């Protein structure tokens, strides 16, 4: 039977919130440094290993398989700068990608340009952002250490290939924007105090500002550019115009996709940098949508906006007079990407969760379609004055294709640059398909199903995945672990585009936000049940999984119909809605989650609260949560807090309940290859063990 679970401490503390007393027997989970939390972590992982030793040999086996399936050169898009082509590349097992600088597109011997590999001994360092100078003799990159979101900016000059002594500290969400050959604009957070480990505190983000630092001088001469006293809680970012005359600042309230944008002039006087504060024209100052900037032509200013257009729309707004005129009206599709070069505008549309590429000149805005194989655009490089464009397109079948193009006439210039081919894999062994199934709304929802052609039955192992949050659509994308699942385990993968995502744009998220948030979970239920009525899945042979908010989905749907699932995993997921507003950047999450002060919002929040909604005496599936000690993007405590209830809530019925907390790890952005590979291997061994899906030889 199930072994004796670790003796969890029970805390008497109970707090009253909106005239409702919530007890909390695990408050000591706030501080990771407490002895109780550390001993509980150690015991939980010891029992995890004891459970897993039953099929540790299969663990090693599929570890070997995933390692052999991960070994391929991952080449990204080329960048054309100063007659040299810089593109990311990996040997396949090296911890981080390294830049390649080639003299030509067809060059055989490109040299290394940027190498994060030797930065840290364990390779924990991850490159986060980069930016270019207009004279192509300067670039500024920004990385992070120990998986902590707190970053560090370094600067390098191309020709000498040497570092510089300038470094910056405690920076988050870095947006470098250089101005001619003098300096660059960035954002910086208030100075931290104490001896706490970097990125190892729960303090909420506040009192940050954007500023500008010039080269040749220390950080001490940095002059504050913009800081808002009226709204301390908002986030904001800066951007330099390619016309080299104006600076654009964008302000978001929380994480919800509305912003107000301010345009300012720039003085050519060197002393003016630090002489007087810069004025700000009130271009848009009310939250009507996300008014992203694309490019400007003199007085004219082109933006992709959601105002008066739920599916995104390209509009030209003159800032010297204040008139607004629409130039590219919204089609029935949703804009995934857009850019403006010379006279043409090239737009990638996420139509039916498929990117179709269109180009339209300023004369006739007819979006003319340029052929491109089915897939999903991941990265996109573009420069207004340049004549070379490139993008990587990948999906479930395609492991990645770097494709370049000429803006002047794509009619005969679309060419293949590189392919991320993986040995021992064939396209014909698998096939994907779209499906439409009706939810309670009476409106069809799309879903993707990828499966190996041939043997597929209702009892075959099923994995179902869907994120659906923050207006990020779960577009098709390759995964080595997914391919190991597909080919080595003979199962079928399915991806849900649930309501509330950007899969249909702003209206979809608007319908799936705040008061109707619970609605999305109901949809997920139908998803799995539909796969059982179509003949693709059986309740004893299904597993669903997701990350962060998607991980949320899993646990919360387990509260609705636990017996409708059998295998469930959580991964750095938000679970403690009662206190999610307090710690980390969760305050921005309120803009998508309901502000807990508002009573009508706390009604639904307490309705679906997965930390407390779990009930005893009812069967539950086996949850496996994964966390890391240095998790600042999401506070790790919430996840363990979830397990904290189950330990006492189900003595020997349901589960089993696994918590894998890995020492010295990240969040998911910049994970070292060894650690992420080991974690994926363990996750898939667990889902195979609790599904009984033998080796598909």
Numbering used by the authors: 1 to 697
Tell me, in the authors' exact words, what the paper reports.
It degrades collagen and fibronectin extracellular matrix components on host cells, facilitating parasite invasion. Our cryo-EM data confirm that TcPOP comprises two distinct domains: a catalytic α/β-hydrolase domain, which houses the active site featuring the catalytic triad, and a β-propeller domain, which likely regulates substrate access.
Here we report the three-dimensional structure of TcPOP in open and closed conformation, at a global resolution of 3.8 and 3.6 Å, respectively, determined using single-particle cryo-electron microscopy. The initial data collection, comprised of 20,080 micrographs, revealed severe preferential orientation, resulting in poor map reconstructions. This significantly improved the number of views, and the resulting map was drastically improved with continuous density and minimal anisotropic features. Our data show that TcPOP clearly fluctuates between open and closed states independently from the presence of the substrate, confirming that the observed open and closed conformations occur in solution and are observed without the usage of any additive. Taken together, our HDX-MS data corroborate with the existence of the TcPOP open and closed conformations that could be resolved in cryo-EM, and with the presence of intermediate conformations that arise from the switching of selected helices and loops at different rates.
